[PDB]
Structure 1
Amino acid sequence: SDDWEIPDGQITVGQRIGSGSFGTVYKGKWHGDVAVKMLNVTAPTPQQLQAFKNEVGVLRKTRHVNILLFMGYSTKPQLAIVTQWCEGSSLYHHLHIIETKFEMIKLIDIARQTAQGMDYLHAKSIIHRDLKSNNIFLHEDLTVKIGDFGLATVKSRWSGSHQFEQLSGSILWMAPEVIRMQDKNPYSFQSDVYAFGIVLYELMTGQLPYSNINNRDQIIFMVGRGYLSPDLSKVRSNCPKAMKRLMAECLKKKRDERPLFPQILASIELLARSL
C-alpha cells in the first residue's frame, strides 16, 4: 500500500480537545467521529516528511482489539494525524480526576488488556515511546484502547537528516535510561516495559509515583541518577503479592533486568486465575 493521505475538505475539524507532548487534539468528523491531532511540526522537511510517511505505513498495518485504529494523516492546512475517536474518559481521568472506584478484579483486567495490546505492538516490533494512563482509554467502560504509540519521527523536530530525541513526554513514565538520553536509542521495549510498570503503580495505588516530590527537575535528575524510585509501600492492602512482585520487576533501574511482554502478560493472567 501507499498513499494513506487524506485530502483537505474531508475532515470536519470540530472542538478543541487538548494538547499533549507532541500535538493538539480536535474531535473531527470523517466517516464518523475521529480524533485529529495537529502535530507541532507544522512545517516539516522532505527528509522528515518521508520518514513520517514510512512510519504511517507500519502504524496503518496494525489491527488489535486493544489498539486504537490509525486511519492515516493529512497535509492540507497543516500536518495532522487521524485516529479513532474514543468515548468515555482516559485511564488518567478515572484514576486521578474522577477517582472512579474499581475492584481488584477490574483493575487486574485493565492491566491484562494493556499487556495484551502492548505485546501485539512488540510482536510487530513497535516501540510505544509514550505509554501512560493518559494514552489508555476505557472504551464504553469495557475494552482497553492504547493510543499515541510509535510516531518517533514526529517527536523531536529534525535538523535536516537527524532525529536526536530531545526527550519529551511526561517524566513520570520515562525509564531512567530514557531520562539520560545518553546512548544512541534510549527508547526500547524495556523503556516501554518500565512505563508499563508505572501504569501498574497507578492502578495498584490510586496515586502517581513520587507523591511527595513536587519538583519537576528534581524528579528528572534523581530518577536518571538512580536515586529516586517509585515507593512501593503505597500499594493497596488488597493487591496480590504476585502483582506487587511483577510490578517491581518492570521498574528495574538497569533496563536489561526488566522482563518482556510475553512473560509479563503470562504472569498477569496467572494471578487473575489464582484470585
Structure 2
Amino acid sequence: GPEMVRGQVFDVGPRYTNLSYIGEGAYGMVCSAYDNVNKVRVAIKKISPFEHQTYCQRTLREIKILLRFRHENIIGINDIIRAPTIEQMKDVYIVQDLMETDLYKLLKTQHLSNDHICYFLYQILRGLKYIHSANVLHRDLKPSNLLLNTTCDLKICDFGLARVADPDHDHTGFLTEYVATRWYRAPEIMLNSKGYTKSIDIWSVGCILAEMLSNRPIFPGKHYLDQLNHILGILGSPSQEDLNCIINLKARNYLLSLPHKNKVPWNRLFPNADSKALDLLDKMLTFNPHKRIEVEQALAHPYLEQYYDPSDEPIAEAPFKFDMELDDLPKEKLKELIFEETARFQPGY
C-alpha cells in the first residue's frame, strides 16, 4: 500500500519512501521523504485542491511560477507526481530538496547574532529581488516560509499565495483580499484590500526582521481588525498626508475615526538592536506603501553593505506577463491546466 502520514495517503512510491510529517494547511500537507532514485532527502507537498476554484488557482500559480524560477534563495521543484489520467487525479505532489529547518523553528530555540540576522535578511531580499523582478508578488512571507540549513543558506518557499501582476496593466480593484498571514499583513491589505502592490512583501520582510531582533512577532493581532490597531499602536496615527493617500473613502473615514496614537520609537522596542537594522526596519515598516523602501534600495541600505553586490544578484531574464494570470476560470478548466503544466514529469509525454 501507499504510505500514510497522519491519515493522509501519500501516493508517491516506489521512488519516494520513509515519509515524515512536516506541516499542513487547509488543503495540503508537507512531508519529508527519501528519493531512492537520486539517493537524496526531499520534501513532498501534497496538494488536494480540485473541489474549489481558489485552491486550483493557487495550485496552478505555485506550479507555473516555481517551474519558471531558478534562484539560490528560492525553493526549486525537482519533480511533480499525479495520476496518469485527469479523472484519477485528486492530488498533486510537489517534490523539493529537503532543508533542515525554518526561521520560525530557529527563533524558538536561539537568539540570533547580529551577523546571522544581517545575513538572513540579505538572502531574503536577494530572493525577493528576483521574485519582484519577475513581476511576482509572494504575498505570504513569514518565518515558517524561510527555510534554513546549517550552512545558513536560506530559501523562500510556499508560493501558494503568489501571483503575477503584469505592470503593463493596472491591477487596482482586481487583487484578492485577505492575503498574507495576519501578523505579516501590510496596512493597505486592510485599507486598500483589492489594490495593494508588491510592497506588501517588503512590509512582511520588515515584520520578519523585527521578529529576528526580538524572537517575538512585532504585530500579533488577535483577529483581522485587531491587526491594524497593533500596527498603529507602534507607528502612531498616520499623518494627514498619508491619510489623504488612502483612496478608499470608507477606509479613510475608518482611520479618521480612530483615537490618536503616538509613534513608539524603534530603539524603545529594540534597545539592543543595531541602529542600522532599526533604520532599515523603519523604512520597511513605512505606513504609506508608495514611500516604503523597495527591494533594491533595501539591499543597498548600509545595514547590508557587507553583502550587497548587484553583480551577484540575479534577476528574471523573462519577467512574467498577463499570460501567467489567466486563471479566472471554472475549477474544472483549472484542473485541466494543472494536468497540462505537470505533464512534463510523466512517463511518456
Partner of 1:36: helix, strand, or coil? Answer: strand
Shift in Å, 1:43: 2.8
CA distance in 1, matches of 2:52, 2:144: 26
CA distance in 1, matches of 2:297, 2:132: 12
Q: 1:76-155, aligned counterparts within 5 Å? A: 76=83, 78-95=90-107, 97-98=108-109, 100-149=110-159, 151-152=161-162
Change (3 A) 1:202 1:41: same
In structure 2, what is the equivalent of residue 28 of structure 1? 33
In structure 2, what is the equivalent of residue 194 of structure 1? 203
Q: RMSD of aligned C-alpha atoms?
A: 3.2
Return the match for 2:19 from 14, 24, 33. Answer: 14
Change (3 A) 1:182 1:137: closer
CA distance in 1, matches of 2:78, 2:201: 23
CA distance in 2, matches of 1:144, 1:27: 18
Change (3 A) 1:136 1:51: closer
Identity %: 21
Are 2:43 and 2:97, in contact at CA under 8 Å, matched by a contact in 1? yes
In structure 1, what is the equivalent of residue 69 of structure 2? 62
Are 1:21 and 1:170, in contact at CA under 8 Å, matched by a contact in 2? no
In structure 2, what is the equivalent of residue 173 of structure 1? 184
CA distance in 2, matches of 1:169, 1:50: 16
Shift in Å, 1:134: 0.8
Shift in Å, 1:125: 1.8
Q: Give the unaligned 5+ runs of structure 2.
A: 1-10, 84-88, 164-173, 236-263, 309-349
CA distance in 2, matches of 1:206, 1:16: 25
Listed one character per residue, the Cα deviations across residues 169-222 of structure 1 (whole Å, up to 9, x for unaligned) are: 521111112234633x43x320000001001101122221146x6x33453352
Listed one character per residue, the Cα deviations across residues 84-141 of structure 1 (whole Å, up to 9, x for unaligned) are: 243322111111x22x133212221111111111111111222111111111121224
Are 2:140 and 2:162, in contact at CA under 8 Å, matched by a contact in 1? no
Shift in Å, 1:57: 3.0
Shift in Å, 1:53: 4.2
Are 2:61 and 2:159, in contact at CA under 8 Å, matched by a contact in 1? no
Structure 1, 57-66 or 244-253: larger mean CA deviation? 57-66
Partner of 1:16: helix, strand, or coil? Answer: strand
Are 1:87 and 1:140, in contact at CA under 8 Å, matched by a contact in 2? no
What amino acid is aligned across from residue 41 of structure 2 in structure 1?
D
Q: Which has the larger radius of gyration?
A: 2
Pair 1:263 & 2:268 matched: no
Listed one character per residue, the Cα deviations across residues 1-44 of structure 1 (whole Å, up to 9, x for unaligned) are: xxxxxx96554472222213663212234443322222352435
In structure 1, what is the equivalent of residue 169 of structure 2? none
Listed one character per residue, the Cα deviations across residues 201-251 of structure 1 (whole Å, up to 9, x for unaligned) are: 01122221146x6x334533525xx634476322142x2222211111111
Change (3 A) 1:272 1:207: farther
Change (3 A) 1:48 1:72: farther
Partner of 2:232: helix, strand, or coil? Answer: coil
TM-score, normalised by the number of residues in structure 2: 0.61
In structure 1, what is the equivalent of residue 229 of structure 2? 222
Partner of 1:64: helix, strand, or coil? Answer: coil
CA distance in 1, matches of 2:65, 2:30: 22
TM-score, normalised by the number of residues in structure 1: 0.76
What amino acid is aligned across from residue 234 of structure 1 in structure 2?
L
Change (3 A) 1:78 1:84: same
Are 1:129 and 1:192, in contact at CA under 8 Å, matched by a contact in 2? yes
In structure 2, what is the equivalent of residue 182 of structure 1? 193
Are 1:36 and 1:80, in contact at CA under 8 Å, matched by a contact in 2? no
Are 2:48 and 2:90, in contact at CA under 8 Å, matched by a contact in 1? no
CA distance in 2, matches of 1:48, 1:195: 23
CA distance in 1, matches of 2:34, 2:191: 40
Pair 1:206 & 2:206 matched: no
Change (3 A) 1:166 1:140: same
